[PDB]
Amino acid sequence: MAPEEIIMDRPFLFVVRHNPTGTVLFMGQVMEP
């Protein structure tokens, strides 16, 4: 009884943005937390 699990155990990418304007404020490459 559980939906598809999505683990971020490998180096991922992250993009924080302001949707309405499409302004990519910050970007990231997390290789090792």
Partner 1 sequence: VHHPPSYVAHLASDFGVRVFQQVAQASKDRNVVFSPYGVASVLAMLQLTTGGETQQQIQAAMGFKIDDKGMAPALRHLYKELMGPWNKDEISTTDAIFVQRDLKLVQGFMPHFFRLFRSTVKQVDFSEVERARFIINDWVKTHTKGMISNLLGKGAVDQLTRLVLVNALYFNGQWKTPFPDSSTHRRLFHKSDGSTVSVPMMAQTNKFNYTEFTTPDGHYYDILELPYHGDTLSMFIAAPYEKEVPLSALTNILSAQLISHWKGNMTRLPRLLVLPKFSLETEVDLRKPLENLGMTDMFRQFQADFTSLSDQEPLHVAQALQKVKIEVNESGTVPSSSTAVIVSAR
Rounded Cα distance, 28 and 12, in Å: 8
- The yes or no reply on residue 1 touching partner 1 (CB under 8 A) is no
For the bound state, the minimum distance from the C-beta of residue 1 to partner 1, rounded and expressed in Å, comes to: 11
For the bound state, the minimum distance from the C-beta of residue 17 to partner 1, rounded and expressed in Å, comes to: 7
Residues 2-31 that bind partner 1 (CB under 8 A): 2-31
Rounded Cα distance, 14 and 27, in Å: 6
Q: Tokens for 30? A: 């997390």
Which residues contact partner 1 (rule: CB under 8 A)?
Answer: 2-33
